[PDB]
Amino acid sequence: QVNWPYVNTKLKRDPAVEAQIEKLLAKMTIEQKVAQMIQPEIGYLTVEQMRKYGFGSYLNGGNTAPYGNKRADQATWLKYADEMYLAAMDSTLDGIAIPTVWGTDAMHGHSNVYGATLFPHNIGLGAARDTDLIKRIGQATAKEVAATGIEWSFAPTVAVVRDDRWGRTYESYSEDPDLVKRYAGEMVTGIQGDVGADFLKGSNRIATAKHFVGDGGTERGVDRGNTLIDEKGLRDIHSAGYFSAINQGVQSVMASFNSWNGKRVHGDKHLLTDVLKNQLGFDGFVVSDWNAHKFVEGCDLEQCAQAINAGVDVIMVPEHFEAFYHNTVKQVKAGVIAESRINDAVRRFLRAKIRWGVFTKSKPSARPESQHPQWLGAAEHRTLAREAVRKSLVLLKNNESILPIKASSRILVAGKGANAINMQAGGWSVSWQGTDNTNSDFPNATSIFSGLQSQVTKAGGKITLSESGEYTSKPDVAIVVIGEEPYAEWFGDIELLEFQHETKHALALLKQLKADNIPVVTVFLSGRPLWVNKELNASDAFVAAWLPGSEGEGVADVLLTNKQGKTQFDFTGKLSFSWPKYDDQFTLNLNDADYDPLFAYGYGLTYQDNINVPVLSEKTSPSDSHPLFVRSLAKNMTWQLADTSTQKVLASGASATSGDKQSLLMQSVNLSYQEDGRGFNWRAQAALSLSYLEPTPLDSKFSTGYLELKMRIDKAPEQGANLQVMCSESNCLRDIDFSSFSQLMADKSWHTLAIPLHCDDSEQPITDALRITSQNLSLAIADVALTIKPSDDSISLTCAKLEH
Ligand SMILES: [Ca+2]
Ligand code: NA
């Protein structure tokens, strides 16, 4: 029994707020309470629906601006907010006047919004090591969010990332929990105000700290993957940001997409209630992530009692909110969700809305914090962001002290990222992936080239832009801006650490310039360290710039001298992530037993250093199968879920249950890709089968072959379990007890099993290709296929072949 510390020691309840909550609850219907718990998204919600139901909140999802615009004036935002506000205050139809609130993700500023200041993504902020800077970024963020009429912003993100292959690595301040703990509370107080007289007042927003918990610890860094760690490790590594965020009175916590030791966090009452609420003492409300409830066992897009019962208070159900609402109401009335649970949810959420002041403030457009449209993209905020850019940069290499570069020089700027704001901003920047962004999507932003050109012009130097490294007058030095393309979430999941392993385009450019005897300073844009020994060798200087955001001139500020030729700003950033020396150092973290990084956590050169980096090793580390379930069901194949009391259920989708909706539950899990696996839970006697739709004789091609599959056993079957292979109602080719290979599976992770079909004591057409039977078991299956010979990494569940 892991002891988690009680950290809710500063924020005290407000007796008046609690009185209002209770007076409201005593009179509310089940329908109204549930209504408080449901959150639609603006791409799917109408004003009419808000009027009818009075949802407790609604989401600015980012895919569209209000009214369908890509761009909208602040006034337009405020009109939309007013419309929803008035629809919620209308007690016609729904019978009550509880003000709704608008929520939005604030990944690096109010980053869904055209024209908003874009701060550097978290990895660079972590490199900055500046808590006051973080707090100020929070205050600026609060103002820019308020300027669009939004009361509730999701920040900070407190993931602690342990495997850089994750596509969300840049959203984390550090691989190390300590930095995240220092930062989280600063961001929270920056947004919400300090605990005390100004708590949640004025321009301060309601904040949500994301995500609880362990999403930066999934196996191989697979997005929404499986976090395999004991509870003490979850506490000591992945939860540090929540200690300070909860301590500072964060009003909301968002649950995480990943699973913990095979079980989805969104359905885990131990984590979301006992740990988060009871032990840590969190007094605010839990919001789910985007349709996360659909991944919970027994749940789907339109229903999820388990998540609610586990401790989720507000359900982010952007599209299917209406059906979800009615189902949840029927579930509360049926007793499968106790009213005390919805009461508690409503208390926790109303505690936030009421203390923020939804009853005391006017409609959005008339509020004091709504009278400053200039807050959105404010010059002052861009100055702050520029400071953040300067402090985020980490100087990895500076041979013969080539940096800083004389501003009066003739400089060539090259590389695909030289004048591409979309690359410097990364994902979650106006659009989701950022791929389709061009410079015109970032008004008032400054590309890196533009900043350099501005300062070089002021200093009387010469500058040329050519992505491909073309020049007329041979330059004194070339600044080459290269890096990853923008990405978000699983789109950014990678398997290889080597930069551009498929093309090595940037390397070619660098070597070309080096071959012309031109000194090379590389500005590297990325959401994470990557293996770049080759590019490092082709560079005289090399700067990790991360994803700096809108203020690209922050780069010039550090790389160039002023007009007089003197240093204007030195490097200050230090690695918050370890930099890999080899292309397979996937889990390189400070305090690791074997810690052999190229550049350690905390490394960063300055102009005061006279260090050369030597040439580094550029050496890298080193058929006819018939698919049944590889990534998806093959033709003529279906799942079957059979319990004791009802007809067998044929399922072909991402999830399902047996007839009794309780005994056997199927969900989707993530081995490598999204939803390439299926997880299963036996709570009572039941049989799962991977079955042919029409009984099919075994293909002679595989008569002396193998059924091969990948299996993870989260919890070993207490009452035993049975694995049958190639069955025909009358009998099966193989019948294997789980107890007989349990020691292979005791790491609770995936294994590739090969199961020979031709054994001693070996007819009929096959109806169940695979069949698993148990009263109590938890596992996941993936990549089920017929093979002629066992794959290399496979383990054989063998048999006597004496007869052959
Ligand atoms: Ca690391
Ligand atoms: Na209402």
Positive or negative: CA dihedral 521, 526, 529, 530: negative
Catalytic residue among 105, 151, 369, 489: 489
The CA 533 to ligand 1 mean position distance, Å, reads 17
d(CA 89, CA 548): 41
- Catalytic-residue membership of 289: yes
- The structure tokens 């069901």 sit at 633
Q: Is 167 exposed, middle or buried (0-12, 13-18, 19+ CB in 10 A)?
A: buried
Sheet holding 766-774, edge to edge: 649-651, 637-642, 686-696, 766-774, 721-727, 732-737
CATH 3.40.50.2000 fits 378-623, yes or no: no
The CA 46 to ligand 2 mean position distance, Å, reads 14
Q: How was this structure determined?
A: X-ray
Q: At the fourth CATH level, which superfamily is domain 1-377?
A: Glycoside hydrolase, family 3, N-terminal domain (3.20.20.300)
Nearest partner of 37 among 338, 315, 334, judged by Cα: 315
Query: What are the residues whose beta carbon lies below 5 Å from ligand 1 (ion)?
Result: 175, 578, 588-589
The CA 548 to ligand 1 mean position distance, Å, reads 20
d(CA 695, CA 457): 77
- Catalytic-residue membership of 489: yes
Find the ligand nearest to 126 CA: 1
Backbone torsion region of residue 675, taken as left when φ is above 0, otherwise alpha when ψ lies between -120 and 50, otherwise beta: left
CA dihedral 242, 243, 249, 255 (to 10 degrees): 20
Beta carbons within 8 Å of 4's beta carbon, 6+ residues apart = 235, 239, 275, 279, 280
Q: Chain-centre distance of CA 158, in angstroms?
A: 11
Beta bridge partners of 525: 483, 546
The CA 88 to ligand 2 mean position distance, Å, reads 4
CA dihedral 429, 435, 438, 443 (to 10 degrees): 0
Half-sphere exposure of 521 (CA within 13 A, CB side): 25
Beta carbons within 8 Å of 445's beta carbon, 6+ residues apart = 118, 421, 425, 439, 549, 550, 551, 552
- The structure tokens 């994470």 sit at 528
Beta bridge partners of 633: 629
- The structure tokens 């009615």 sit at 326
Beta bridge partners of 581: none
DSSP-H helix ranges across 311-447: 321-334, 339-356, 379-392, 421-425
Catalytic residue among 144, 289, 387, 783: 289
Q: At the fourth CATH level, which superfamily is domain 624-804?
A: Galactose-binding lectin (2.60.120.430)
Beta carbons within 8 Å of 182's beta carbon, 6+ residues apart = 131, 244
Backbone torsion region of residue 717, taken as left when φ is above 0, otherwise alpha when ψ lies between -120 and 50, otherwise beta: beta
d(CA 555, CA 525): 11
d(CA 427, CA 491): 10
Per-residue exposure over 77-90, b if at least 16 CB sit within 10 Å of its own CB, e if not? bbbbbbbbbebbbb
> Which stretch of DSSP H or E encloses residue 708?
strand 706-715
Helix 339-356, helix 15-27: angle, nearest 10: 130
Structural tokens at position 522 = 């590389």
Cβ-contact 439, 494 below 8 angstroms: no
Cβ-contact 92, 51 below 8 angstroms: yes
Cis omega before residue 156 (within 30°)?
yes
Nearest partner of 655 among 271, 244, 306, judged by Cα: 306
In the chain, where does the domain assigned CATH 3.40.50.1700 lie? 378-623
In the chain, where does the domain assigned CATH 3.20.20.300 lie? 1-377
Reduced to 3 states, what is the DSSP secondary structure of residue 106? coil
Cβ-contact 550, 147 below 8 angstroms: no
In the chain, where does the domain assigned CATH 2.60.120.430 lie? 624-804
Find the ligand nearest to 172 CA: 1
